[PDB]
């Protein structure tokens, strides 16, 4: 009856704790499309369509960041999220953001959207960004504060917004974008998180974000 | 270590065959809190905290319905489950159900939740209901079909749900409820089935069910 994608976007992007593993050794299985990181409670399984990258990462110490969802028994899944552990930046870089809210542009940078990775996954930046947008603009509704109240509750999220895009602007002239309100075919994380299966990375010092949020009735 | 309550709720409510005995004579023991029904393989022992009811039932022909669990040697236990054999309905009555799934209400009646007893145990209705909810909504996970796939697998049951209630609405009214995810203190049937020890009955023609299933992390 309902759209499970609404609660799932809000939960998985803004309430559930992100995966944040540093310098963890992959288990080096024969599985071509997965890396696997074991701990005392569960195994985290990363899936990617970049088999060549994953082959190179087999048995290496790696960083993992993003959104996980439940697997059978003591397993959890994440799409991509994996980076190498060869070099880092000397400190956290806050990613510069150009943001348009109902067509009105401003700029912001925040400790809440930052990385010290030399190459960071687009996933890590995106999930941090959406958590921040929920905090500041209540984009998915029910953020639990008064921040973003000025935009109303007209959308099916009980928010002011139902259209939005994050655009990664590379030093290039290249870009790529994700839809902030994409719920996949069924509103389930196995579907909507699949956008991260390329394990796309960006050079952290050499990109910025353009963000757009709006409403259409 | 795991939560044995997960597998036990799934097994005892949805895989293990329910006790369904009709017009069986109690053995008329001196035991105040138990009735006993003997067959060629084992004795089924019903336990209740309603000593007055059990005293009245001693040595009578009775109906027994619910969930049994293992006793020593050739014995099995059930909490309550016992009704008299004086009168019945002319055919089975499907119990009307109001159900909320993630806050969305609909109505259903089904042959799978029905009784022809004039007074039926809340136990019989509850266990039938939960088997039906597993079939239709995969509430306890691993139902073995695609029904309920649309709710996902985020919960520790590998299902879309971790909060739920069945409410018996009497026509007076008077309600009482059971928690659909209660596992008792230890996850064992001797514990979680104890909710049925009152041998509570309802007048079958004069009640309906309100059911609520949802998820929180
Ligand atoms: Cl499981
Ligand atoms: Cl990398
Ligand atoms: Cl509004
Ligand atoms: Cl909307
Ligand atoms: Cl709402
Ligand atoms: Cl999809
Ligand atoms: Cl780049
Ligand atoms: Cl069993
Ligand atoms: Cl009775
Ligand atoms: Cl009917
Ligand atoms: Cl899910
Ligand atoms: Cl859970
Ligand atoms: Cl009643």
Which DSSP string corresponds to A85-112?
Answer: SS-EEEEEEEPPEEEEETTEEEEE--TT
Q: Does B138 touch chain A (CB under 8 A)?
A: no
A107 and A197, same structural domain?
yes
B197 and B93, same structural domain?
yes
Instruction: Tell me the C-alpha to C-alpha distance, in Å, between residue B154 and each of A72, A190, B91.
Output: 10, 10, 41
SS (H, E, C) chain B: CCCHHHHHHHHHHHCCCCEEEEEEECCCCCCCCEEEEECCCCEEEEECCCHHHHHHHCCCEEEEEECEEECCCCEEEEECCEEECCCEEEEEEECCEEEEECCEEEEECCCCCEEEECEEEHHHHHHHHHHHHHHHHCCCCCCCCCCCHHHCCCCCCCCCCCEEEEEEEECCCCEEEEECCCCCCCCCHHHHHHHHCCCCEEECCCEEEEEEEECCC
The residue among A15, A14, A56, A75 whose CA lies nearest residue A201 is A56
Residue B134's contacts (CB-CB under 8 Å, 6 or more residues apart) are: B10, B13, B14, B140, B143
Distance in Å, alpha carbon of B157 to nearest chain A alpha carbon = 9
Residues of B in contact with A188 (CB under 8 A): 150, 152
Residues of A in contact with B146 (CB under 8 A): none
Q: What is the dihedral of CA B102, B108, B111, B115, to 10 degrees?
A: 90
- CB-CB contact of B211 with B201 (8 Å): no
The H or E element containing residue A67 is: none
φ and ψ at residue A9, rounded to 5 degrees: -60, -45
Burial of A93 (0-12, 13-18, 19+ CB in 10 A): middle
Q: Is the CB of A2 less than 8 angstroms away from the CB of B104?
A: yes
Instruction: Tell me the C-alpha to C-alpha distance, in Å, between residue A82 and each of A129, A194, B60, B96, B111.
Output: 18, 14, 69, 51, 51
The residue among B1, B15, B10, B2 whose CA lies nearest residue B181 is B10
B66 and B99, same structural domain?
no
For ligand 2, the distance from its centroid to the CA atom of residue A56, given in whole angstroms, is 10
Alpha-carbon gap, residue A153 to A139, rounded angstroms: 10
The structure tokens 């003997």 sit at: B38
Q: Does B137 touch chain A (CB under 8 A)?
A: no
Residue B106: strand pairing partners: B99
Count of C-beta atoms within a 10 Å radius of residue A29: 12
Alpha-carbon gap, residue A70 to A61, rounded angstroms: 23
- CB-CB contact of B35 with B62 (8 Å): yes
Structure-block tokens of residue A180: 């902030």
SS (H, E, C) A5-48: HHHHHHHHHHCCCCEEEEEEECCCCCCCCEEEEECCCCEEEEEC
- CB-CB contact of A66 with A18 (8 Å): yes
Return the SS3 of A129: helix
What domain count does chain B have? Answer: 2
A95 and A199, same structural domain?
yes
Please tell me the total number of residues recorded for chain B in this structure. 217
For this PDB entry, the determination method is X-ray
Q: Does B153 touch chain A (CB under 8 A)?
A: yes
Residue B8's contacts (CB-CB under 8 Å, 6 or more residues apart) are: B183, B187, B188, B189, B192
Alpha-carbon gap, residue A205 to A119, rounded angstroms: 9
* Selected residues 76-135 of chain B with any CB under 8 Å from a CB in chain A: 101-106
CATH number of the domain that B22 lies in? 2.40.50.110
A205 and A107, same structural domain?
yes
Q: Is the CB of A70 less than 8 angstroms away from the CB of B217?
A: no
A163-170 and A175-179: which strand pairing?
antiparallel
* Selected residues 53-72 of chain A with any CB under 8 Å from a CB in chain B: 69-70, 72
Final residue before a domain boundary, out of B86, B117, B139? B86
For ligand 4, the distance from its centroid to the CA atom of residue A155, given in whole angstroms, is 4
A179 and A146, same structural domain?
yes
Q: Is the CB of A4 less than 8 angstroms away from the CB of B101?
A: no
Q: What is the dihedral of CA B170, B172, B174, B179, to 10 degrees?
A: 10
Resolution of the entry in angstroms: 1.6
Burial of B44 (0-12, 13-18, 19+ CB in 10 A): buried
B171 and B92, same structural domain?
yes
Burial of B165 (0-12, 13-18, 19+ CB in 10 A): middle
Count of C-beta atoms within a 10 Å radius of residue B179: 12
A19-25 and A43-47: which strand pairing?
unpaired
Alpha-carbon gap, residue A117 to A202, rounded angstroms: 10
Final residue before a domain boundary, out of B86, B107, B123? B86
- CB-CB contact of A186 with A194 (8 Å): no
A69 and A25, same structural domain?
yes
Structure-block tokens of residue B129: 């209901």
The structure tokens 């209660």 sit at: B182
φ and ψ at residue A108, rounded to 5 degrees: -150, 145
Q: What is the dihedral of CA B12, B15, B19, B20, to 10 degrees?
A: 140
Instruction: Tell me the C-alpha to C-alpha distance, in Å, between residue B71 and each of A32, A36, A85, B45, B195.
Output: 49, 43, 57, 9, 18
Count of C-beta atoms within a 10 Å radius of residue B148: 22
The structure tokens 């069924």 sit at: A186
The residue among B107, B95, B101 whose CA lies nearest residue B164 is B101
Radius of gyration of chain B (CA): 17
For ligand 1, the distance from its centroid to the CA atom of residue B120, given in whole angstroms, is 34
- Chosen from B4, B154, B155, B216 to mutate, greatest number of chain A CBs within 10 A: B154
- Chosen from B152, B162, B213 to mutate, greatest number of chain A CBs within 10 A: B152
B126 and B199, same structural domain?
yes
Alpha-carbon gap, residue A36 to A28, rounded angstroms: 7
B111 and B28, same structural domain?
no
φ and ψ at residue A36, rounded to 5 degrees: -145, 130
Distance of CA B114 to the CA centre of its chain: 12
B11 and B22, same structural domain?
no
The structure tokens 């996949």 sit at: A184
Instruction: Tell me the C-alpha to C-alpha distance, in Å, between residue A6 and each of A2, A13, A156, A187.
Output: 9, 11, 8, 7
Burial of B43 (0-12, 13-18, 19+ CB in 10 A): middle
Burial of A191 (0-12, 13-18, 19+ CB in 10 A): middle
Please give the residue range of the domain that contains residue B97: 1-16+87-217
The residue among A119, A118, A121, A98 whose CA lies nearest residue A108 is A98
User: How many CA atoms, within 13 angstroms, populate the side-chain half-sphere of residue A85?
Assistant: 15
A213 and A128, same structural domain?
yes
Residue B192's contacts (CB-CB under 8 Å, 6 or more residues apart) are: B5, B8, B9, B12, B182, B183, B184
The residue among A35, A14, A10, A16 whose CA lies nearest residue A24 is A35
Alpha-carbon gap, residue B155 to B166, rounded angstroms: 19
A207-214 and B97-101: which strand pairing?
unpaired
For ligand 9, the distance from its centroid to the CA atom of residue B90, given in whole angstroms, is 17
Structure-block tokens of residue A41: 């409670």
The residue among B106, B131, B148 whose CA lies nearest residue A4 is B148
Return the SS3 of A184: coil
CATH number of the domain that B154 lies in? 3.10.20.120
The structure tokens 């439940």 sit at: A70
For ligand 1, the distance from its centroid to the CA atom of residue A117, given in whole angstroms, is 34
Final residue before a domain boundary, out of B36, B71, B86? B86
Residues of B in contact with A2 (CB under 8 A): 101-104
């Amino acid at each position: 009856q309902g759209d499970i994608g609404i609660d799932n976007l809000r939960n998985f992007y803004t309430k559930k704790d992100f995966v944040d593993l540093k310098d963890v050794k992959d288990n080096d299985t024969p599985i071509a499309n997965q890396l696997q990181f074991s701990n005392e409670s569960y195994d985290l399984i990363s899936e990617s369509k970049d088999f060549n990258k994953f082959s190179n990462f087999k048995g290496k110490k790696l960083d993992v960041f993003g959104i996980s969802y439940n697997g059978q028994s003591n397993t959890k899944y994440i799409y991509g999220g994996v980076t190498a552990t060869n070099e880092y930046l000397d400190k956290s870089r806050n990613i510069p953001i150009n943001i348009w809210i109902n067509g009105n542009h401003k700029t912001i940078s925040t400790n809440k959207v930052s990385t010290n990775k030399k190459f960071v996954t687009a996933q890590e930046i995106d999930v941090k960004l959406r958590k921040y947008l929920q905090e500041e603009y209540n984009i998915y509704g029910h953020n639990g504060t008064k921040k973003g109240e000025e935009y109303g509750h007209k959308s099916k999220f009980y928010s002011g917004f139902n259209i939005g895009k994050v655009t990664f602007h590379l030093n290039n002239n290249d870009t790529f974008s994700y839809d902030l309100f994409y719920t996949g075919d069924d509103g389930l994380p196995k579907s909507f998180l699949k956008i991260y299966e390329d394990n796309k990375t960006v050079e952290s010092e050499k990109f910025h974000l353009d963000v757009d949020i709006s409403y259409k009735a």
